[PDB]
Amino acid sequence: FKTTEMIGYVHSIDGTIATLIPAPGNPGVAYNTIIQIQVSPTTFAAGLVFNLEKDGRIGIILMDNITEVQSGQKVMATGQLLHIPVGAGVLGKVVNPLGHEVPVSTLGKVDTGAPNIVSRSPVNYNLLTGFKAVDTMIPIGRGQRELIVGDRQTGKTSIAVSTIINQVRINQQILSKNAVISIYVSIGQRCSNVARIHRLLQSYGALRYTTVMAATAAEPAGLQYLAPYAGVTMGEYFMNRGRHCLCVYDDLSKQAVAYRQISLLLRRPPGREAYPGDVFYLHSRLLERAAMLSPGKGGGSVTALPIVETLSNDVTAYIVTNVISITDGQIYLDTKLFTGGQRPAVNIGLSVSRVGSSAQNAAMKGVAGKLKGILAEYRKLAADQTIPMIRGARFVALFNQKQPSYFMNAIVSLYACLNGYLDDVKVQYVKFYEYLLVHRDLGIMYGTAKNKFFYMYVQELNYLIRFFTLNSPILHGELEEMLKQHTHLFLQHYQSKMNAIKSEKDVKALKNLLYSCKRAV
Amino acid sequence: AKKYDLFGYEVDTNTAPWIEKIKKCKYYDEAGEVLVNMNVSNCPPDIATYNATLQCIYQSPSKQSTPVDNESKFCAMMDLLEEMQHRNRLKPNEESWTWVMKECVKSGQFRLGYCIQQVMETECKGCPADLVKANEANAQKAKTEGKEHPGHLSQQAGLFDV
Amino acid sequence: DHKGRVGHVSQVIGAVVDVHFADGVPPVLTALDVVDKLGRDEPLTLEIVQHLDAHTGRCIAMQTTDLLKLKAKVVSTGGNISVPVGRETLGRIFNVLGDAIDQRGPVGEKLRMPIHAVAPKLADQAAEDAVLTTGIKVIDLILPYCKGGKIGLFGGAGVGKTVIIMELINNVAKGHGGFSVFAGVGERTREGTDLYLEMMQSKVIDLKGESKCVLVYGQMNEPPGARARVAQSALTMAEYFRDVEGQDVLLFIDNIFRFTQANSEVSALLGRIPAAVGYQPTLAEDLGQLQERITSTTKGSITSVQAVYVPADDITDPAPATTFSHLDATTVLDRAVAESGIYPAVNPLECASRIMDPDVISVDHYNVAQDVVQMLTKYRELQDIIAVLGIDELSEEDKLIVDRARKLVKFLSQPFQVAEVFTGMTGHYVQLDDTIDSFSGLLMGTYDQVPEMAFYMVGGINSVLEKAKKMAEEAAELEKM
Amino acid sequence: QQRTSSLYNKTRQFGITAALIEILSAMSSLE
Numbered sequence A: 001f002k003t004t005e006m007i008g009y010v011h012s013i014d015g016t017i018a019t020l021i022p023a024p025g026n027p028g029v030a031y032n033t034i035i036q037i038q039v040s041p042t043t044f045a046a047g048l049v050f051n052l053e054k055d056g057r058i059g060i061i062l063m064d065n066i067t068e069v070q071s072g073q074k075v076m077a078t079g080q081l082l083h084i085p086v087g088a089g090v091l092g093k094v095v096n097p098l099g100h101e102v103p104v105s106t107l108g109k110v111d112t113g114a115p116n117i118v119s120r121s122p123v124n125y126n127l128l129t130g131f132k133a134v135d136t137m138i139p140i141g142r143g144q145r146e147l148i149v150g151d152r153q154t155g156k157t158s159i160a161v162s163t164i165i166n167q168v169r170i171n172q173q174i175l176s177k178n179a180v181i182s183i184y185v186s187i188g189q190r191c192s193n194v195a196r197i198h199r200l201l202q203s204y205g206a207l208r209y210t211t212v213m214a215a216t217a218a219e220p221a222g223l224q225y226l227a228p229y230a231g232v233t234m235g236e237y238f239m240n241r242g243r244h245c246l247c248v249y250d251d252l253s254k255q256a257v258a259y260r261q262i263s264l265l266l267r268r269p270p271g272r273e274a275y276p277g278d279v280f281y282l283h284s285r286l287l288e289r290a291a292m293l294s295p296g297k298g299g300g301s302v303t304a305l306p307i308v309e310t311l312s313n314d315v316t317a318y319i320v321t322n323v324i325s326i327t328d329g330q331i332y333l334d335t336k337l338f339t340g341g342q343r344p345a346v347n348i349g350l351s352v353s354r355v356g357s358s359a360q361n362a363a364m365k366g367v368a369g370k371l372k373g374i375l376a377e378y379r380k381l382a383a384d385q386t387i388p389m390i391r392g393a394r395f396v397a398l399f400n401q402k403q404p405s406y407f408m409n410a411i412v413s414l415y416a417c418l419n420g421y422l423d424d425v426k427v428q429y430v431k432f433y434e435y436l437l438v439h440r441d442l443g444i445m446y447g448t449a450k451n452k453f454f455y456m457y458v459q460e461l462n463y464l465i466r467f468f469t470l471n472s473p474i475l476h477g478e479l480e481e482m483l484k485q486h487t488h489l490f491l492q493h494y495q496s497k498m499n500a501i502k503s504e505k506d507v508k509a510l511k512n513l514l515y516s517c518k519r520a521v
Numbered sequence B: 001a002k003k004y005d006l007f008g009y010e011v012d013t014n015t016a017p018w019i020e021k022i023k024k025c026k027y028y029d030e031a032g033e034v035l036v037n038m039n040v041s042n043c044p045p046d047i048a049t050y051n052a053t054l055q056c057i058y059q060s061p062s063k064q065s066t067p068v069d070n071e072s073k074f075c076a077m078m079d080l081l082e083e084m085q086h087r088n089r090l091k092p093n094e095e096s097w098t099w100v101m102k103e104c105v106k107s108g109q110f111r112l113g114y115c116i117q118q119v120m121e122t123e124c125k126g127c128p129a130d131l132v133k134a135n136e137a138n139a140q141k142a143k144t145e146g147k148e149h150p151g152h153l154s155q156q157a158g159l160f161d162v
Numbered sequence C: 001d002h003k004g005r006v007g008h009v010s011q012v013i014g015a016v017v018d019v020h021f022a023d024g025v026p027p028v029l030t031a032l033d034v035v036d037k038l039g040r041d042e043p044l045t046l047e048i049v050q051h052l053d054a055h056t057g058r059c060i061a062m063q064t065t066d067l068l069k070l071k072a073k074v075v076s077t078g079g080n081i082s083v084p085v086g087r088e089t090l091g092r093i094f095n096v097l098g099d100a101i102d103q104r105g106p107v108g109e110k111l112r113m114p115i116h117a118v119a120p121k122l123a124d125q126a127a128e129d130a131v132l133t134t135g136i137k138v139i140d141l142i143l144p145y146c147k148g149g150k151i152g153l154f155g156g157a158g159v160g161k162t163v164i165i166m167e168l169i170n171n172v173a174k175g176h177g178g179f180s181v182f183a184g185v186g187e188r189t190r191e192g193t194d195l196y197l198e199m200m201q202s203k204v205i206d207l208k209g210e211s212k213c214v215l216v217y218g219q220m221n222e223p224p225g226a227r228a229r230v231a232q233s234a235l236t237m238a239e240y241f242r243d244v245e246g247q248d249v250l251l252f253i254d255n256i257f258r259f260t261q262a263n264s265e266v267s268a269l270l271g272r273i274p275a276a277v278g279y280q281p282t283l284a285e286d287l288g289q290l291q292e293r294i295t296s297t298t299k300g301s302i303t304s305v306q307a308v309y310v311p312a313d314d315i316t317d318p319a320p321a322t323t324f325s326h327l328d329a330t331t332v333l334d335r336a337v338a339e340s341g342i343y344p345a346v347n348p349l350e351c352a353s354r355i356m357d358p359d360v361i362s363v364d365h366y367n368v369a370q371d372v373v374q375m376l377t378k379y380r381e382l383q384d385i386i387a388v389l390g391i392d393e394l395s396e397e398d399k400l401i402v403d404r405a406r407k408l409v410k411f412l413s414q415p416f417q418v419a420e421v422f423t424g425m426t427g428h429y430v431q432l433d434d435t436i437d438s439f440s441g442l443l444m445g446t447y448d449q450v451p452e453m454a455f456y457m458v459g460g461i462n463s464v465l466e467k468a469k470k471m472a473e474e475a476a477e478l479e480k481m
Numbered sequence D: 001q002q003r004t005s006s007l008y009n010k011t012r013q014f015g016i017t018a019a020l021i022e023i024l025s026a027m028s029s030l031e
């Protein structure tokens, strides 16, 4: 960073916070600016200004070289807000909130105002998480803020990380103008968890279209506080230059705890659960910078996926209730559904998307509009077998998945259940039915194929379906052949075995087959 | 004629300068970078601009010096159609879908070609010719040479496989 | 007096800023422009809230306090924060200060009024007890909104407050000879765009011609000083149309909790000790001075719909609980009602209206409306018995009450015209005469043979019998197959 | 009924401790 004037000396330190005494003359540093403390003649230590007291004293939040900071050291000022390295060159790398790269480009302001009323536009472009549960019932649009809430070990990170991994299959094929560049912010997490996500992103080719913001638990509260702000700054570059972006904050709960530490240590009056007055304002100005811009300013986007940990399914906590009131609905992950079997454990009743219908694709809007009617009647009738009861139960079996599904492979398996192709098929054999639909194909296997274009091995039909939809004169008759061949052959040849196999070493072989089918969609 | 965006501000209809940028294309990912730069300077893509982009997707190789994994000129092409139809609200003319038919026969993906001639015959009528026989040639080429489809589908194994 | 009186910034702790004046401090609520240059893109304006001594005064920032050095030059404006008023404001969008934020040239103003006006006296008050037909079944029947009424929509996060305000703008604010004002108090900036566009499409706001709406937005992105004061800015504009022009006017505050919450931020930094549940000690007084200005005077008539956020679904919380006393029609939205399938999610037992009275509304309106409330009260008692004992264990007459009461809960639901995207069905404006007659017949038992799901998510009786005909025909086909 | 009433009574007392610790931790910040 760029020094200018020697504003004062270091007076007191209290871990990662300090206060200064002004130098002779009393220059007075500007508010919210970076200041460099001379720890040695050669080295500096950055810090942010948080309090400008009447005395002339200046409150500092320490950032770098905290062990090397001492009382009586000289303090140089920048007279500027925090700028960081941003661009396409930062992708595929791990970086601090201050901008330094972690071993394993024009700048932009971290403290920036959000787009105003006429700057934004209604969210129309879809953002595929790659989950049949989410993309139908709780659909995320580009520029939307969709919360992820739930307990520890409910799949909050995995559903956020797999959403970034789901973009690679599209991003590779599509024009780079419409590619979803991701920004995973890791606030207060364990260090090895960031390494495992780095390897997991690298193995699925995600690092090409992703940059990892990182402020681990070892690193101070100053960095954790500022980490989501640095994450959005990197996304806003793509937004303001007419491209679409994704921002995951994992998680805002640990950011708030870091901000509470800073506020309490600098004698800011605490309120509810010991947090300061402006802990709502902390998350509000962060999440509002995520938006969908107008045609007049490129039509770019920053989609936000803030994660917020709840303690024993308690939504009444102050930090959780704040973030719910800011975001455009949530994706609630229930602990009982996780242990029960459903993974991802998406509680559809508790979850909600405030801009769902307009966000979805034309094809996905066709099937999903009916699913709301079926699952509404299924949930009611389950408490108190109809056609809704049969077809409703199969949807629940289909929603279970480990890795994210491709848009073609998802929508066809849901369309089958909608029109009632899995009615004669039992509930336990839905994943075996879905596996044989996607990877294999029964019409081409046995004999009775004779489709001119529509097959499941041809992955390129994905984008034709998105244009025309399934309910359309081009694909309707050709699709209903594929499914009729698949059902009749599966019921006759494949499901006949299950009435038979009632012996040791065949019942176990059936189980191990069906359990592996839950993973691959 | 004059035009206004969704709010009612003035919009730059001057398309022709940005068209000649797309003609100097070389690799087709550069065309998208231009399409970004028009929107940034309050100039929405014209119906002719999309067709000029579609031309560049057909002619050039893919990304740049290096190849990307799973390139698919068709998938990049069909995404651009989805953008103009649904979001920007523009019906693609006869020129639009003719560029799509060319890429099916050029790359050899005949199965797509069968689906899109059905589309071209029903939606935008035009003249369903020249490429229909070239597409049907590639269909017979797969049959006579060896076999159609891949070998994972043919297998006939069944039972407890994977 | 005190017009361009110079001062210097004594202390800066967040949005709260102290200012030292050499020739004495200005009055309270006095706006101050920060003249000093800095590296700013946007200006800074401070409003004095407290006095510390004769020469020092504590303030709150309307914009961010970034780059603000100590001893920075500050100058007074003349009085309070001034906001433009009159018919030149109609069609335009504004911020807390009154600057146009829509990029459509300079406003025509010709007069400006201060944000902090005093509330009307007892002599200025007047009651005009007429029913404002909202076209919504649960509201018009059970808790009818009156003309001149202050109305509040209480509910937790994601229950249908913003949806109900939008439906009321469709149902009532369009066919209205008066103007309207929308206080976007600390809510989503993205929701503000959709309102601006949908009003431009429907031509309540018109660029080329006549406009009948004003927008004043102080959203979540803005600091607490703006979000606190932005409710009053909109109220000043509505006060001009009320007092000066002498007119019936609508006000729309989404959300009034965000006013109280914004004051809760500054109040901590100002050095006040917090009261119950960490709110400011002046919580009742803050709402007092704001809500009392919103009233029907002898000169004109404000008719304010407000949204009220119930934090953590805790209705006993001070922020809603204090607000309830001020309102004429209290609308309470419940989460369990929303999740069960009934939209709008109005829990009619916790709701109330002042004009629910045989004198104001008709005798047939009151008697039918009371029977719905009575039947639903019996139904909640019977619902606990069926869970324990069973449906078969109930009496012969009580079974028929359950069949009617189940239909009453379903018939209270309504597909909204703004919520066509959500429901996937066209909207229904249900007339007051239709609402009273259809519910009256259901209580009599004229529609006992009509099935239950016919009543779910429809308008009046014609749409019920239409859906029942479609259910009879489709059930006849599936039975034949 | 016994065990839920005890939890109501624990929550009543734990609430008032936590209420007052926050309220008086405020004025320790204010001196």
Ligand SMILES: Nc1ncnc2c1ncn2[C@@H]1O[C@H](COP(=O)(O)OP(=O)(O)O)[C@@H](O)[C@H]1O
Pocket (backbone or CB within 6 Å): A151, A152, A153, A154, A155, A156, A157, A158, A159, A343, A344, A345, A401, A402, A403
């Ligand atoms: N859909 C899923 N199916 C199976 N296992 C999952 C799924 N999602 C997450 N997990 C597993 O659960 C564990 C916790 O997941 P994580 O996403 O870290 O949850 P949290 O963020 O709540 O800690 C991980 O070991 C992960 O492999």
Ligand SMILES: Nc1ncnc2c1ncn2[C@@H]1O[C@H](COP(=O)(O)OP(=O)(O)O)[C@@H](O)[C@H]1O
Pocket (backbone or CB within 6 Å): A352, A353, A354, A355, C155, C156, C157, C158, C159, C160, C161, C162, C163, C164, C343, C344, C345, C414, C415, C416, C419, C422, C423
């Ligand atoms: N009348 C209604 N019809 C359909 N959906 C509704 C209705 N009212 C509320 N909702 C649902 O509630 C969600 C958010 O409601 P909203 O009013 O925006 O939140 P809040 O109550 O916090 O203002 C929407 O996603 C929508 O599905």
Ligand SMILES: [Mg+2]
Pocket (backbone or CB within 6 Å): A156, A157, A158, A250
């Ligand atoms: Mg996690």
Ligand SMILES: [Mg+2]
Pocket (backbone or CB within 6 Å): C161, C162
């Ligand atoms: Mg709302």
